[PDB]
């Protein structure tokens, strides 16, 4: 049984981690199912719905990756192009020796998790990339990195002659049928925007930063985010967007049991909880690891679990889907609670959905 299942997993988790609100959406047998808990705003008491806007943090990277793939499919660049081919200001830099695909998959050579301290203007960002010295040879190490995929999204949008935000809001989101998903939440929708809650229980929301839109800037609810997942299960429409989504299901290297694609990370299905936790642990996400290189990028197919974790100061999100079994789960919360718990919860739920 569906509702009691989700409730049984989710609600104890909300109490244990003091999660004020969570929106959950699952895909099964071709239908969306919504389960909503608690409040978007603990002081007003406004209840969470599938239309409540959450910061989804790095789940945004899957949309950025899709935009990037779309630009590639439309001929703005080839994934194997050197980065400086698409960044005149980077010619002569280390990015002469880095591909767009490496940049998208955090394997450029040791770009850090966050921009350094005062790399926080466009002009200082440009100087930063220009003067960057690789820690590792290109394509040998995976180090999860906002600068890395941030630059990828930025240059990809530029290859079509548009700012990232414009290409996302005027082309990609509308073509995916996502009309309630935002990089900047309009006044008209501000009523739906949840508050995040810090470790100290203060209401907070993410602020704009250098390449923040690209790396972790999407606000959306569970309904829209599930629609994006549905497009990843079977999109039939514009051939280009279909081809783009297909590119995000391509694997470029692996780290242990996890295969890195564009935005999505995936596992061989069926996958155990232990393997899913490991692939999403600090061991993989907060340090550089040598990769298992692929002879050529590989279409990963349907017998996979695809996922992405996402966090901001006040928000915690998780998404996972399994195309061959037609199941997916979206979990959006307004507290940045341990990824470990997100993963157990989702695994327990998906396990039941499969059955
Ligand atoms: Na069974
Ligand atoms: Zn239902
Ligand atoms: Zn500054
Ligand atoms: Zn630029
Ligand atoms: Zn629209
Ligand atoms: Zn696919």
Author numbering: 7 to 361
How does the study describe this entry?
Plasmid-based extended-spectrum AmpC enzymes, such as the FOX β-lactamases, are increasingly found in clinical isolates from antibiotic-resistant infections. FOX-4 is of interest because it rapidly hydrolyzes cephamycins. The first generation of BATSIs inactivated serine β-lactamases (Ambler classes A, C, and D) through a dative and reversible covalent bond to the active site serine nucleophile. In this analysis, the structure of FOX-4 in complex with SM23 and LP06, a ceftazidime mimic, is described.
LP06 has the R1 side chain of CAZ and aztreonam. Firstly, LP06 (CAZ analog) solution in DMSO was added to the crystallization drop to bring the inhibitor concentration to 9 mM, and the crystal was frozen after 2 h. The electron density map at a resolution of 1.9 Å shows the LP06 (CAZ analog) molecule covalently attached to S64, but the oxyimino side chain, past the imine nitrogen, is missing. In contrast to the SM23 (CEF analog) complex in which inhibitor binding caused change in the unit cell parameters, the LP06 (CAZ analog) complex has the same unit cell as apo FOX-4. The R1 side chain rings adopt different conformations in FOX-4. In cefoxitin and LP06 (CAZ analog), the ring is perpendicular with Y221 and makes side-to-face π-stacking interactions; in SM23 (CEF analog), it moves out of range. The bulky oxime group, which is missing in the FOX-4 structure, is well resolved in the E. coli AmpC structures with the carboxylate oriented toward its canonical carboxylate binding pocket (N343, R349). The same replacements may account for the disordered oxime side chain of LP06 (CAZ analog), which binds in the same location. It is notable that the cefotaxime-like BATSI shows a slightly lower affinity than LP06 (CAZ analog), suggesting that while the larger oxime side chain of LP06 is disordered, it does contribute somewhat to the overall affinity. LP06 (CAZ analog) mimics the CTX-like BATSI, and binds 2.5-fold more tightly, suggesting that the extended oxime side chain encourages binding.
